[PDB]
Amino acid sequence: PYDASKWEFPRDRLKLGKPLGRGAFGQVIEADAFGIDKTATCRTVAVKMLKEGATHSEHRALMSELKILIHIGHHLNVVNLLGACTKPGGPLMVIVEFCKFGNLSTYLRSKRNEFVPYKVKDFLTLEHLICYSFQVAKGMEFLASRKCIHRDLAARNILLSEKNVVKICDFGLPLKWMAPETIFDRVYTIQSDVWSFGVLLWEIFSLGASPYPGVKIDEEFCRRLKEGTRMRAPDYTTPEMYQTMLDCWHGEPSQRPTFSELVEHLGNLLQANA
Numbered sequence: 001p002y003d004a005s006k007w008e009f010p011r012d013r014l015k016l017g018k019p020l021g022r023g024a025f026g027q028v029i030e031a032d033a034f035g036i037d038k039t040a041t042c043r044t045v046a047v048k049m050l051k052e053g054a055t056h057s058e059h060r061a062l063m064s065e066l067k068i069l070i071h072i073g074h075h076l077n078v079v080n081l082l083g084a085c086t087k088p089g090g091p092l093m094v095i096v097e098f099c100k101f102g103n104l105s106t107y108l109r110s111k112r113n114e115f116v117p118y119k120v121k122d123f124l125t126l127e128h129l130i131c132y133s134f135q136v137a138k139g140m141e142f143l144a145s146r147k148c149i150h151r152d153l154a155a156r157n158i159l160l161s162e163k164n165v166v167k168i169c170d171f172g173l174p175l176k177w178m179a180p181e182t183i184f185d186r187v188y189t190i191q192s193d194v195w196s197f198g199v200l201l202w203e204i205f206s207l208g209a210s211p212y213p214g215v216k217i218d219e220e221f222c223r224r225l226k227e228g229t230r231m232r233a234p235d236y237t238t239p240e241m242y243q244t245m246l247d248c249w250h251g252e253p254s255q256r257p258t259f260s261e262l263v264e265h266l267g268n269l270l271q272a273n274a
């Protein structure tokens with residue numbers, strides 16, 4: 001059940017602004033929420049709202065997401081729920097903390113000319129890339145502990161906040177990030193998200209490059225994946241990091257590492273890079 005006293009926010013205390021994403025359900029927009037932090041301050045927030053012409057299935061989907069977000073709770077590497085507009089008088093709105101710097105893929109592409117493996121300014125290092133990977137693994141380990149499956153784990157869903165802090169989100173087909181059991185059997189598990197994490201590692205260590213470059217996405221691509229074909233090492237990877245991708249891309253879901261194993265593994269690589 002939904003706790004109104006804890007999550008209900010007044011529509012009049014919200015000032016909608018610049019759009020961030022657009023889907024068939026509605027849109028993600030940037031807004032200013034006045035006194036959302038049990039105070040009288042102004043906070044910039046991200047709002048997911050339904051269009052005027054909305055399906056009952058669309059309303060159920062946004063309500064489910066609100067319930068999933070209430071269930072998740074707070075974690076530093078997961079977008080935090082601040083409120084909701086569920087009461088009649090306007091459209092259904094889901095309010096989360098805003099991430100100013102956008103998605104990691106777009107950010108890393110803008111920093112290709114600003115990369116050095118290590119410092120002996122506004123530059124990325126190997127430590128940064130391992131840190132982002134580590135933070136995503138931590139947030140995914142938390143989602144697994146709350147018995148949640150992401151369904152769309154990709155760099156476009158990894159947002160960057162202040163102090164190099166990355167947060168897992170969901171703006172919502174994405175065959176490049178999909179595990180073989182998800183394509184061929186439609187099985188969605190936490191182990192199929194491990195496969196997606198491997199693709200996300202490739203995105204991080206290629207500095208925002210698109211997975212499977214120049215490869216046609218169809219039936220042949222799918223048959224090659226099932227046959228054991230894998231992506232070659234990206235341009236900015238370490239040998240250990242590429243092996244971690246290959247472990248995530250194991251054909252058998254049970255033979256892939258868990259997010260808890262990846263947290264420990266990436267945590268040690270961060271130490272070893274120093």
Ligand SMILES: O=C(Nc1cccc(C(F)(F)F)c1)c1ccccc1NCc1ccncc1
Nearest residue numbers: 046047048079094096097098099168169170171
């Ligand atoms: O991400 C949202 N919901 C969500 C749903 C399911 C799972 C998870 C997860 F990933 F956290 F488990 C998160 C979300 C909700 C409301 C508005 C924007 C949203 N995202 C885009 C955004 C853009 C800029 N700044 C912050 C966020």
